[PDB]
Design a protein around this ligand. Sequence first.
Ligand code: 1NP
Ligand code: 1NP
Lengths: 377, 377
Amino acid sequence: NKPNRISPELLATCGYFMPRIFFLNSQYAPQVHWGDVVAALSHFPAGNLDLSSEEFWYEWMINWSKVGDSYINIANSAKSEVSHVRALRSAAACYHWAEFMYFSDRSRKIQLREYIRSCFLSSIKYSDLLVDHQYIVVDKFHMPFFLIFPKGYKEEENHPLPCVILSNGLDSMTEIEILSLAEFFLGKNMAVAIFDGPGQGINLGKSPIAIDMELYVSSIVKLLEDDARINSNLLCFLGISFGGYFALRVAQRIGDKFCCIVNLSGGPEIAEFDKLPRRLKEDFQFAFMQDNSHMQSIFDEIKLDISLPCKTKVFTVHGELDDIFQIDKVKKLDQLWGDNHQLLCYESEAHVCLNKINEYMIQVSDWVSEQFWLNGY
Amino acid sequence: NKPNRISPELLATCGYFMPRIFFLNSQYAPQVHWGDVVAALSHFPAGNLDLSSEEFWYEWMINWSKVGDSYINIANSAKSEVSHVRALRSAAACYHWAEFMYFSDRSRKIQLREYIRSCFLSSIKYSDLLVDHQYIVVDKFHMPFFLIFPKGYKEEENHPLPCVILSNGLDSMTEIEILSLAEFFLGKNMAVAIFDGPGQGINLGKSPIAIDMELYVSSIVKLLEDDARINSNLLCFLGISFGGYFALRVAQRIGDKFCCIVNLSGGPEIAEFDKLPRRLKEDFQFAFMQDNSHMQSIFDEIKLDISLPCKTKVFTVHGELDDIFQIDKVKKLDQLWGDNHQLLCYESEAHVCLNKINEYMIQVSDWVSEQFWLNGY
Ligand SMILES: Oc1cccc2ccccc12
Ligand SMILES: Oc1cccc2ccccc12
């Protein structure tokens, strides 16, 4: 027999998603090893290389679920707490990539996201970071909220810390990609706030995604204001992908509540829904819980009034070849918003510039620190 | 223009090395992101896909050096210590993969390994782990030695800790792959000992690799014996690749000095030198500092006398399709060494079973803990 390997065709086919799957080298956030991708794709059915097809992402979910199951078996039979957590993290990462682009079975997708959240809540007891977990009541909506503090934090010894609020994209999971981003701010002795708004994290497939997410961010700001451990005059809001769109909304509506805002490849409007690749349509359809015919109408409502003033400092990281949020619309916003907006545009980079994420998160993390220092920190 | 990507041909060509390049998801040890591989291989010259060729690994070194240089620029212009260290780690990882399979310019290879060691020694001041760095004098040889302690270690509060000694392979760097392995033992509140024997780490290309490495391990055991912080009755020796061969030697000569020994894909003898792929010959040639004609004679001297008794518990992880250390020779040793030896053989896995490294290091780390517990810990 030959050594277990990913077929040349399939490996080349998934080139767009490989940067997404590996994402950031994290300390706490679940992350796959190369071997996990091999375990998933080594026995992937032949003649199935269409990313637009529903058949491809079914087999993707099936095969990634198998690797997830294997790590849960290791976790259950683990002889130490450290080994148990390592296995649970690997399982959580595998289950996320199984579901993140799977929208065919609503019940199965919710189940996989419930697995990940169960693993996350259970891991908190073994964590060496203080995690204040509670529900924020916004009207009738009970929003899952997590306030995480830096390593070796003591309330008595330390002064009120700055806090960074981070928002999910359309297909991200809170304790995976967003916790991965959050570690760059925890590393700089900042508190971090991660949340599941309507249609976000565990709520994806249950409640429709709220276009007016700033309403839910306002409720987080109110909590941080009342929290003595948090310096409410030193707040940042970060958004990634569709989360970046919410960042631009926050900058317009409640921007004066923040020292700075980070937009990771969000835009003032999305490209033509019909012309989107076939999986992004289903992605958007599932997040908003609407059919094909209704989506272009929602995209029209989403389109921002760029005229409305920017109430704080905004830093945007965007790729030239972004096929979701078109660069021309972002450069239009950059010119109009003027000195309040900073644009880091990457040549020959796709949506979220994932080939540059390590270097641009170093720059982004330093930029946020500078904005707090400029506000007398 | 198209998005920056690794060519399907080159990505398929490097399938054997991708598990090696990404290795383990580490906290401290330098590690590449997917984007770093893209930055290295995106502009790799076309019609250059021969892994046996000297031209391929020159361009490999050139292109990986470029990514290393980029991270050093980020490190120098970094606005924080945390950002500086993140960049230095990325640079160190990039420079290692530039040199690890490059043997054409001895001066350039030593320079790249000197860059990595300089970055490592400079990072120690920013480390939250206690790193006792000194030289162990073995005859006339000044051996670089690093004794690292677990997170939040206090000598006064804590009792004498167990310590794991880890050995380099032929083409590994101490603060990259071996520190990555070491983190599994630091996570279990064990001290770790990593060293540069003759022809190992910074000494590769300077001094020939010592076949009798147990002589240098004996000097480490003597230091750990004299060290009050280390429980010398609770010692383990781990070796990876050719380091695994040293582990089998240690088990025979000074095995009674260790509770247990871990052999990660070492063997009692190497396959026919002439029949090795063309880059492993140059690899072995460079490590031993000998020409093609002399190597098969050294391989004959290397071959262990399996008859000699095993003086401690040994755990071997090996792949069925290992083309360096043949499985039949390891299974021969397993049968003869009997109850003292445990074999974890992976079906359809190559040398070091890199597609399984996460799961087998979880099992290995738990096995070592169990052997210490059996010796009254
Ligand atoms: O929706 C997202 C959230 C976080 C990261 C992403 C990267 C690529 C594409 C989409 C993403
Ligand atoms: O020599 C080595 C040291 C550490 C890890 C390795 C993995 C594969 C092949 C060789 C290796």
